[PDB]
Design a protein around this ligand. Structure first.
Ligand SMILES: Cc1ccc(O)cc1Nc1ccnc2ccc(S(C)(=O)=O)cc12
Ligand SMILES: Cc1ccc(O)cc1Nc1ccnc2ccc(S(C)(=O)=O)cc12
Lengths: 277, 283
């Protein structure tokens, strides 16, 4: 019955508070800890801030954003985590002048790590379903390893709608949500395009998706030089299938990815990363 | 501890560990690599009780960026073990002395390693109550896939709240030889000397008891040109740090916090790209 408690952090211990972004679930700032001498990130606004913190603390694993502690004062309320210096997967894929080249090995490693993380969540007792996966929520650490974030909408099994399966928003309203999101993410990673960019109104997307339309798969979106192209397209297509029952579990998904990741020499990952610097 | 939020360490059935491969055998037990059948990640497992379980409780409570991360325990009539993330690059000890396999070990990496160990030990000392490692050595500093530091082996560690404490002779302060908050810093100093020189401390002496005598008198590892070449970045501020940390007097030894404060500017003199370059050089 081994237990660990989340440390409590005094606000006066957070020096150099600098703004990073404003979001639906609060504001994120970077800082340094006065005693530990490390950079941290702080997300400040209540029941919600307390909830995400408990989830990160219970869901700790190699591919989940690691929580360092909580700031629980009458004057200030925040979640403290390690700092992710390389932003989000969304920025890596779409800031093409800042990152003209993103080598395949790193793209596949990112996909593998996201699957590993969600798999772990689904394998907790009770299972945790993220339900808000998107490229903006996949953070990248100092070495470009994945840390899944934003547990605000996650549910214990007991904005943008491009990553949401049709059954969630059909009129008169799931354990197959995360895999749907993963399929859209995979498509996005392998093409560096925004899904449905050509569609100005989100309701037209929602309507198209409910009718079975999905991001386009052809040579312009997914070029023929993509390593293991057939295997990935096939994984993407089953992942976003109309019928949730036909979507694979993350175990199946990982068993498919494994042989692909074995083809890359370990040094090519390091070379892909230094090319970004 | 705040709000009373708690996290439990998962139990892992032994049969969920596939592909067991022997890695090593030491004092505290046998260490093997494996892959978790459900989680699909490589893991390391240390097997042979209240001792094994004690390390698991410490690792689980002392979770931090530079502390070996624990994933769960095996608690079965058949088997008892500690399951952690696997460290693909072994120990700092192997990096420093396996000169054929690692012909060159760039300075920025060395300094990053020194900084991370200090950050790790500093965090431990700042816990409430504080934790003291008592067995810091190069064999207990593990290196991950990108050569970042994970401090391991909390077997001889103690919370701060009569025979001498345990440890490895060469990294042990002299006042702990017979029947203290300044044990770790002494070990750190010997570690620092070892990192900058790539030499065995007290290499000349074949008899470990002679070492204990010498150290008691006042000798320390050799600080000259032969051991610490002149081309060492900040050789002076470093040699200063080594000597104050391994003082004969426990009270003339600095806290980890003060060491950090000195090391930060030194680390800021290295460009980010030089760390990645050092790592690619090792592969
Ligand atoms: C703090 C926090 C808590 C909980 C949670 O779900 C997310 C965060 N956010 C972050 C955590 C660590 N590093 C980050 C780095 C950058 C950004 S960004 C994209 O610029 O907003 C956010 C970060
Ligand atoms: C499992 C464990 C538990 C508790 C603890 O204090 C240490 C370990 N060991 C290890 C953990 C993760 N990676 C390792 C990689 C290599 C080795 S070695 C040097 O070959 O013995 C040991 C490792």
């Amino acid at each position: 019955a081994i237990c660990s408690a989340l440390p409590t952090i005094p606000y006066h211990k957070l020096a150099d508070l600098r703004y990073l972004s404003r979001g639906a679930s609060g504001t994120v700032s970077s800082a340094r800890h006065a005693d530990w001498r490390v950079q941290v990130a702080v997300k400040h606004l209540r029941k919600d801030v307390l909830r995400e913190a408990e989830i990160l603390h219970k869901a700790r694993f190699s591919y989940i954003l690691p929580i360092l502690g909580i700031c629980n004062e009458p004057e200030f309320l925040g979640i403290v985590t390690e700092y992710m210096p390389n932003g989000s997967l969304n920025e890596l894929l779409h800031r093409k002048t800042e990152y003209p080249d993103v080598a395949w090995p790193l793209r596949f490693r990112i996909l593998h790590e996201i699957a590993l993380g969600v798999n772990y969540l689904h394998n907790m007792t009770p299972p945790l379903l993220h339900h808000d996966l998107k490229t903006q929520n996949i953070l990248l650490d100092n070495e470009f390893h994945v840390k899944i974030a934003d547990f605000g909408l996650s549910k214990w099994r007991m904005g943008t709608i491009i990553y949401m399966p049709p059954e969630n928003y059909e009129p008169g309203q799931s354990i197959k949500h995360d895999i749907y999101s993963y399929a859209v993410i995979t498509w996005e990673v392998l093409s560096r395009k925004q899904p449905f960019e050509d569609v100005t109104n989100p309701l037209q997307i929602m309507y198209s998706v409910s009718q079975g339309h999905r991001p386009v798969i052809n040579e312009e979106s997914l070029p023929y030089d993509i390593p293991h192209r057939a295997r990935m397209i096939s994984l993407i297509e089953s992942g976003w299938a109309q019928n949730p029952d036909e979507r694979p579990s993350f175990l199946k998904c990982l068993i498919e990815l494994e042989p692909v990741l074995r083809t890359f020499e370990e040094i090519t990952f390091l070379e892909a990363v230094i090319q970004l610097k």
